[PDB]
Symmetry: D3
Subunit: 67 residues, 6 copies
């Protein structure tokens, strides 16, 4: 459990591993998708796998707002 303001729970629906990074796609409430690129080491350490229930976290200063 953490205090971060932006926490979106979802289910992993896609995982593509590279050499240094990995792309994780999560389906969140309503069904919308969140895509994350993290280190491959983290995928392994956190045991990220298709179907896993995980949470996407984003610092507020990284959220752009467009029309």
């Amino acid at each position: 459990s953490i205090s971060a303001r932006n926490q979106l729970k979802g289910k992993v629906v896609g995982l593509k591993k590279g050499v240094v990074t990995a792309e994780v796609v999560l389906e969140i409430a309503g069904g919308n998708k969140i895509t994350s690129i993290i280190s491959l080491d983290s995928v392994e350490e956190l045991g990220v796998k298709e179907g896993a229930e995980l949470t996407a976290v984003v610092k507020s200063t990284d959220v752009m707002i467009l029309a």
Copy 2:
């Protein structure tokens, strides 16, 4: 359109203006909220106000995963 893979449509449910930045809270589908800190100039340009329909845009490399 734009390369950022996370484009979440939502409505403004919170707005706090500073002098250089502003904090905007959007309610997206499924009831999740996402908070953004952006420049006050962008707030003015988009006419951000309570109820406005806007899009939160996040690069995949800015999304962390919490297990």
Copy 3:
């Protein structure tokens, strides 16, 4: 057409595809080069290729200022 304050129009002069990401190099006005690392999926979806006229976009909070 977007409202983002930082928009730099340029021509793709370099493209290197990885497994998860891709590196895109744009020559902007005057000749300055801008390098972007985006997801490979975006390269494909946006149809990014050598010679294409595209625009680089950057959130203001990601711009460091040095001497």
Copy 4:
């Protein structure tokens, strides 16, 4: 030198100070402008003021592409 691939020399054409941050607008070559939100402490350390010659530094993973 530094790893950030985007190092854009420019002159300060806009400056707005907050208490924690500041907004700095640089005019780079070819007439493009780039806006940055940085800590007020950095503004003071660099002596940021209108006309100052500074460098905007952006990591490639923070550059989005708009097609």
Copy 5:
């Protein structure tokens, strides 16, 4: 349990509040200091104050290398 590979424990040695954000300086092990600009909301939720033990969390793609 979070993917960000940089998790640096430290104590608060500086705190400056704005209206939307706050600047927090943490002294980590070995005497290094790290400065963060975060939302004022987070400062209040974590009870940030001088001496507080907190963790600075940084995504690997946000770390530049200077040679």
Copy 6:
């Protein structure tokens, strides 16, 4: 030499090269580790290698604070 507020000197203890990016792990004072993902081009241009003494740099707005 640069003015950036966050500069953490360290020794490269890990290096993994991908096609577009590379993962650099630095042991900083106290012995703790900082992980950076930069472009492969930069590794080559800066001559980054195991054992090298380098400095990690982070913009303050990219530093999240957690309990």
